[PDB]
Structures are given as structure tokens and as C-alpha cells.
Design an enzyme around this catalytic site. Structure first.
Site, PDB file in Angstrom:
ATOM      1  N   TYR A   1      88.996  36.018   5.044  1.00 29.02           N
ATOM      2  CA  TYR A   1      89.424  36.230   6.428  1.00 29.02           C
ATOM      3  C   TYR A   1      89.981  35.068   7.219  1.00 29.02           C
ATOM      4  O   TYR A   1      90.716  35.299   8.206  1.00 29.02           O
ATOM      5  CB  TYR A   1      88.299  36.851   7.242  1.00 29.02           C
ATOM      6  CG  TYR A   1      88.084  38.273   6.875  1.00 29.02           C
ATOM      7  CD1 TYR A   1      87.241  38.630   5.813  1.00 29.02           C
ATOM      8  CD2 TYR A   1      88.742  39.273   7.566  1.00 29.02           C
ATOM      9  CE1 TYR A   1      87.067  39.948   5.455  1.00 29.02           C
ATOM     10  CE2 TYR A   1      88.587  40.590   7.221  1.00 29.02           C
ATOM     11  CZ  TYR A   1      87.747  40.924   6.169  1.00 29.02           C
ATOM     12  OH  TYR A   1      87.623  42.256   5.846  1.00 29.02           O
TER      13      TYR A   1
ATOM     14  N   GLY B   1      92.379  32.570   8.130  1.00 33.26           N
ATOM     15  CA  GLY B   1      93.786  32.380   7.856  1.00 33.26           C
ATOM     16  C   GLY B   1      94.509  33.624   8.336  1.00 33.26           C
ATOM     17  O   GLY B   1      93.885  34.603   8.799  1.00 33.26           O
TER      18      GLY B   1
ATOM     19  N   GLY C   1      95.882  37.099   8.536  1.00 34.87           N
ATOM     20  CA  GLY C   1      95.481  38.299   7.815  1.00 34.87           C
ATOM     21  C   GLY C   1      93.996  38.329   7.454  1.00 34.87           C
ATOM     22  O   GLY C   1      93.177  37.596   8.047  1.00 34.87           O
TER      23      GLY C   1
ATOM     24  N   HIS D   1      86.338  37.260  14.410  1.00 30.13           N
ATOM     25  CA  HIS D   1      87.450  36.710  15.181  1.00 30.13           C
ATOM     26  C   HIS D   1      88.707  37.581  15.008  1.00 30.13           C
ATOM     27  O   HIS D   1      89.419  37.837  15.971  1.00 30.13           O
ATOM     28  CB  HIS D   1      87.715  35.252  14.748  1.00 30.13           C
ATOM     29  CG  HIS D   1      88.754  34.557  15.559  1.00 30.13           C
ATOM     30  ND1 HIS D   1      89.952  34.141  15.030  1.00 30.13           N
ATOM     31  CD2 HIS D   1      88.788  34.229  16.874  1.00 30.13           C
ATOM     32  CE1 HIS D   1      90.692  33.593  15.979  1.00 30.13           C
ATOM     33  NE2 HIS D   1      90.007  33.634  17.106  1.00 30.13           N
ATOM     34  N   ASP D   2      88.969  38.031  13.781  1.00 28.76           N
ATOM     35  CA  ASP D   2      90.121  38.890  13.495  1.00 28.76           C
ATOM     36  C   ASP D   2      89.974  40.244  14.198  1.00 28.76           C
ATOM     37  O   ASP D   2      90.945  40.812  14.672  1.00 28.76           O
ATOM     38  CB  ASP D   2      90.265  39.108  11.980  1.00 28.76           C
ATOM     39  CG  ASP D   2      90.818  37.878  11.243  1.00 28.76           C
ATOM     40  OD1 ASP D   2      90.969  36.811  11.855  1.00 28.76           O
ATOM     41  OD2 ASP D   2      91.115  37.974  10.043  1.00 28.76           O
TER      42      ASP D   2
ATOM     43  N   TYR E   1      90.805  39.667  17.974  1.00 26.03           N
ATOM     44  CA  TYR E   1      92.241  39.658  18.290  1.00 26.03           C
ATOM     45  C   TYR E   1      92.793  41.097  18.256  1.00 26.03           C
ATOM     46  O   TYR E   1      93.626  41.455  19.094  1.00 26.03           O
ATOM     47  CB  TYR E   1      93.005  38.819  17.274  1.00 26.03           C
ATOM     48  CG  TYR E   1      93.010  37.324  17.508  1.00 26.03           C
ATOM     49  CD1 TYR E   1      92.285  36.747  18.555  1.00 26.03           C
ATOM     50  CD2 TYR E   1      93.807  36.494  16.720  1.00 26.03           C
ATOM     51  CE1 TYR E   1      92.364  35.380  18.822  1.00 26.03           C
ATOM     52  CE2 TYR E   1      93.894  35.125  16.968  1.00 26.03           C
ATOM     53  CZ  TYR E   1      93.173  34.573  18.023  1.00 26.03           C
ATOM     54  OH  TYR E   1      93.294  33.222  18.281  1.00 26.03           O
TER      55      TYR E   1
ATOM     56  N   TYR F   1      96.456  29.701  26.656  1.00 28.53           N
ATOM     57  CA  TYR F   1      95.434  29.971  27.669  1.00 28.53           C
ATOM     58  C   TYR F   1      94.906  28.604  28.099  1.00 28.53           C
ATOM     59  O   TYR F   1      95.317  27.576  27.540  1.00 28.53           O
ATOM     60  CB  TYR F   1      94.312  30.918  27.170  1.00 28.53           C
ATOM     61  CG  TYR F   1      93.617  30.472  25.907  1.00 28.53           C
ATOM     62  CD1 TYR F   1      92.755  29.371  25.917  1.00 28.53           C
ATOM     63  CD2 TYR F   1      93.840  31.127  24.700  1.00 28.53           C
ATOM     64  CE1 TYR F   1      92.135  28.924  24.763  1.00 28.53           C
ATOM     65  CE2 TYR F   1      93.223  30.682  23.535  1.00 28.53           C
ATOM     66  CZ  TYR F   1      92.373  29.579  23.576  1.00 28.53           C
ATOM     67  OH  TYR F   1      91.781  29.086  22.437  1.00 28.53           O
TER      68      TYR F   1
ATOM     69  N   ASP G   1      88.358  33.125  20.736  1.00 26.52           N
ATOM     70  CA  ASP G   1      88.440  31.794  20.128  1.00 26.52           C
ATOM     71  C   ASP G   1      87.176  30.950  20.326  1.00 26.52           C
ATOM     72  O   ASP G   1      86.735  30.262  19.396  1.00 26.52           O
ATOM     73  CB  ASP G   1      89.638  31.010  20.686  1.00 26.52           C
ATOM     74  CG  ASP G   1      90.964  31.549  20.232  1.00 26.52           C
ATOM     75  OD1 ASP G   1      91.027  32.391  19.324  1.00 26.52           O
ATOM     76  OD2 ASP G   1      91.976  31.098  20.774  1.00 26.52           O
TER      77      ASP G   1
HETATM   78  C1  GLE Z   1     102.322  31.209   2.618  1.00 31.55           C
HETATM   79  C2  GLE Z   1     101.843  31.280   4.096  1.00 31.55           C
HETATM   80  C3  GLE Z   1     100.309  31.513   4.202  1.00 31.55           C
HETATM   81  C4  GLE Z   1      99.595  30.334   4.888  1.00 31.55           C
HETATM   82  C5  GLE Z   1      99.052  30.769   6.267  1.00 31.55           C
HETATM   83  C6  GLE Z   1     100.016  30.279   7.443  1.00 31.55           C
HETATM   84  C7  GLE Z   1      99.411  29.015   8.233  1.00 31.55           C
HETATM   85  C8  GLE Z   1      99.276  29.282   9.757  1.00 31.55           C
HETATM   86  C9  GLE Z   1      97.785  29.388  10.189  1.00 31.55           C
HETATM   87  C10 GLE Z   1      97.484  30.741  10.812  1.00 31.55           C
HETATM   88  O1  GLE Z   1      96.142  30.664  11.344  1.00 31.55           O
HETATM   89  C11 GLE Z   1      95.293  31.755  10.923  1.00 31.55           C
HETATM   90  C12 GLE Z   1      93.948  31.579  11.626  1.00 31.55           C
HETATM   91  C13 GLE Z   1      93.498  30.071  11.732  1.00 31.55           C
HETATM   92  O2  GLE Z   1      92.179  29.604  11.305  1.00 31.55           O
HETATM   93  C14 GLE Z   1      91.724  28.793  12.369  1.00 31.55           C
HETATM   94  C15 GLE Z   1      92.018  27.253  12.147  1.00 31.55           C
HETATM   95  F1  GLE Z   1      92.819  26.658  13.302  1.00 31.55           F
HETATM   96  F2  GLE Z   1      90.732  26.477  12.063  1.00 31.55           F
HETATM   97  F3  GLE Z   1      92.778  26.976  10.854  1.00 31.55           F
HETATM   98  O3  GLE Z   1      93.361  32.756  12.303  1.00 31.55           O
HETATM   99  P1  GLE Z   1      91.975  33.330  11.695  1.00 31.55           P
HETATM  100  O4  GLE Z   1      91.357  34.365  12.834  1.00 31.55           O
HETATM  101  O5  GLE Z   1      92.327  34.159  10.511  1.00 31.55           O
HETATM  102  O6  GLE Z   1      90.880  32.227  11.288  1.00 31.55           O
HETATM  103  C16 GLE Z   1      89.588  32.763  11.524  1.00 31.55           C
HETATM  104 CA    CA Z   2      92.524  36.329   9.711  1.00 29.28          CA
END
Ligand code: GLE
Ligand code: CA
Ligand code: GLE
Ligand code: CA
Lengths: 123, 123
Positions: B28, B30, B32, B48-49, B52, B73, B99
Site C-alpha cells: 500500500y 506508494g 496505488g 491513509h489510502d 484519500y 494545505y 496525512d
Molecule cells: C514507476 C512509477 C512507480 C513509482 C511511484 C511514483 C513515485 C511518487 C510517490 C507517490 O506517493 C505515494 C504515497 C507516498 O508515501 C508517502 C511518502 F512521502 F513517505 F513516500 O501515498 P501513499 O498513501 O500510498 O503512502 C502511504
Molecule cells: Ca497507496
């Protein structure tokens, strides 16, 4: 930046639109400033102006692209209290402090409608 | 926006670069996310996902031009504590809360290096 300062004054004075209420007041509130402050609120503005001047002398500020007016910083308002964020770098932290002190000062002094758009021929 | 969330995690975990440490973790953390979270930190990311997703359903969010990732924000970090600003409008306030809860969660659970860049063929 100008927008955070606007938001800081509303945090302290919820009933105001600062850009309307405090800009163009006395000899110091607004862009620039010269002469003897006409009242306590005007004195707040003089201190704030000296604060930005102080800031610009700062090495950490001279490196930045923007001046105190467009230099975005981070802060929060919760329960009418202002907190300058620890994420701010040296210059931003200094401006945030300048702005926070002025907002508090504004909220502690009487407002004189007669000094609004003050005839700068009295400065 | 993504930048405030990054700053929130560093407020709670001063020794980290979140974008490096938490992106691409488990099923989770990242962009998606699908499947069963692999651990507690991964569970934080799932919540967190969902947060959002909840946010986007919000009328106040659907009116905005930007999604939760680029929606700026206002917040502050002082003494490793996060405060979502009262200046934030409905949508922004909701994301800031999403967040803030995730940053706190991240700082309360064990980190498993082996789940980094998790083989998404295990999700
Ligand atoms: C090939 C591309 C795939 C790589 C991913 C793109 C990079 C951009 C980052 C997107 O960020 C995804 C994300 C970030 O994780 C938080 C942190 F700042 F600490 F990294 O949301 P999420 O709710 O999923 O985390 C809980
Ligand atoms: Ca995610
Ligand atoms: C003809 C043009 C003259 C009009 C002035 C330009 C308008 C832009 C405002 C610039 O703003 C000047 C200013 C703002 O006053 C604060 C508030 F947000 F409440 F209005 O800085 P100052 O340190 O002097 O206040 C203490
Ligand atoms: Ca001035």
C-alpha cells in the site's frame, strides 16, 4: 509571503480582512514607511518594517530569489494561536517570526479609523 | 499535497527521508495499493489510502482542480508535533487530517526492510 501574514492577522483577529483594514494605515502600515508612527498600531507596523529590513541583511535571505513579500513560509493557526513551522529554513523562519509578532501586536492595540489612508503629508 | 505529507513524516521521524524510506513499501505505501497489507506499517498506508478515497467523495474536494497529491494545505511542526491549520478549507482540512494520522502511524510501527519494494506478486 504576504498571504501567510494576511492569514496570521485573521487568526488573531477573526473579524477582519487585514488587507483592507490594515493596509494604508498611518505612516507605516502598507508598502514603505517613514516618519514618526502616529499611534500604537502604527508603531506595530514600524517594528514589522524594521524586522523585514533586519531579515534582508541576513545571509540566508540574500541567497533566496524572493524578498519578504513573496517568500512563502509555513505556519498554522489553531485556536487563534500562531505557530511558525520548524520546517522553515533560516530566512523563512525569521520572516514568519516578524509576521507573527506583528499579528499579535495588531490584536493588542486600539484601531483609529481616522488614521486610515493617513495623509502621508503628516509623516 | 505530497510535500506537506513528506514534511509531516520528518516531523515525526526526524532521521528519515520518507520519499525514500516509505515509498514502494509493502502492498500500500506508494501510488496505488491492493491486497492484504503485509505488516503494520503497510496497514498504516492502507488506512491513509482509504482516507484519500474518502476525501475524493467529498463535495468540497470534487470542486477543486487538484486531487489529494497536489492539493496544498497548511500545517506546522513544532517540537515534533503536527498541527493542521484552521485556515484550511473543508477539503484541505480533511487531507491534512489523513496525512497527519498516517505520519503518526508510521512513527508508531516497526519498519521491515524486507518489505521495501515489495514484490507486488505477493499482493
Ligand atoms: C514507476 C512509477 C512507480 C513509482 C511511484 C511514483 C513515485 C511518487 C510517490 C507517490 O506517493 C505515494 C504515497 C507516498 O508515501 C508517502 C511518502 F512521502 F513517505 F513516500 O501515498 P501513499 O498513501 O500510498 O503512502 C502511504
Ligand atoms: Ca497507496
Ligand atoms: C498605489 C499603490 C500603493 C498601495 C500599496 C500596495 C498594496 C499591497 C500591500 C503591501 O502590503 C504592505 C504591508 C501589509 O500590511 C499588512 C496587511 F496584510 F494587514 F495589509 O506590509 P507592512 O509591514 O507595511 O504592514 C505593517
Ligand atoms: Ca511598511
Amino acid at each position: 509571503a504576504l498571504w501567510q501574514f494576511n492569514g496570521m492577522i485573521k487568526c488573531k483577529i477573526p473579524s477582519s480582512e487585514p488587507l483592507l483594514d490594515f493596509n494604508n494605515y498611518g505612516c507605516y502600515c502598507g508598502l514603505g514607511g517613514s516618519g514618526t508612527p502616529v499611534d500604537d498600531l502604527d508603531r506595530c507596523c514600524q517594528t514589522h518594517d524594521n524586522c523585514y529590513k533586519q531579515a534582508k541583511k541576513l545571509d540566508s535571505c540574500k541567497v533566496l530569489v524572493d524578498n519578504p513579500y513573496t517568500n512563502n513560509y509555513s505556519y498554522s493557526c489553531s485556536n487563534n494561536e500562531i505557530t511558525c513551522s520548524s520546517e522553515n529554513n533560516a530566512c523563512e523562519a525569521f520572516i514568519c517570526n516578524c509576521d507573527r509578532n506583528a499579528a499579535i501586536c495588531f490584536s493588542k492595540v486600539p484601531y483609529n479609523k481616522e488614521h486610515k489612508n493617513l495623509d502621508k503629508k503628516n509623516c
